[PDB]
Paper text:
Here, we demonstrate that two of the human PCM scaffolds, [name] and Cep15212–14, cooperate to generate a higher-order cylindrical self-assembly capable of recruiting their downstream components, such as Plk4, a key regulator of centriole duplication. Remarkably, short (~50 residues) coiled-coil heterotetramerization regions of [name] and [name] and their neighboring hydrophobic motifs (i.e., [name] P1 and [name] M4d) were necessary and sufficient to generate the cylindrical self-assembly capable of recruiting its guest molecules critical for centriole duplication in vivo.
In particular, identical hydrophobic residues in the parallelly aligned [name] helices appeared to constitute the backbone of the bundle by engaging in pairwise ladder-like interactions (top). [name] helices did not directly interact with each other, but rather interacted with both [name] helices in an antiparallel fashion (middle and bottom).
Author numbering:
A (entry chain C): 499 to 541, 1205 to 1249
B (entry chain A): 499 to 541, 1202 to 1248
Amino acid sequence: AHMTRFLEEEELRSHHILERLDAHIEELKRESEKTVRQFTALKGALEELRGQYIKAVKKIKCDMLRYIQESKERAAEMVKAEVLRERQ
Amino acid sequence: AHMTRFLEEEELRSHHILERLDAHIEELKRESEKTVRQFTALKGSEGALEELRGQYIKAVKKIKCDMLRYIQESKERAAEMVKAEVLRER
């Protein structure tokens, strides 16, 4: 029954990582409506907008790297626990 | 016996998704230079600024869609390991 706990954990880990991507998408969507409103109420905005997407994408790249790195450690931990189970 | 091959595979998948990630970041930067270039000309400037904004949001939705597929596959992998752990009780 080791692996069922592994899958339960993946299911949680999956729910969290997707939550923190929605957070990032929405922040982009909010900041960018504001900035498009500034420019429309006027007659520099290209840098705020592009600035924002770079922000959202950077944060997505960080969070995906932390997930990936956690995943590798988890796998290595299981490699370890398998070898411990070989004890006579 | 089994779990080192799981790790290896995890390493491989992890590098393939990060190639994918930088791949369509860089692609989606090409797509924006075209429409940014239009908006710079017009000083319809705003309808064109919304379109750009709609491309950034859409681009970051495609990144999410690839990231969901990756996650989904991890769940499928772990599921396959529940199965094979069950088969080894045989």
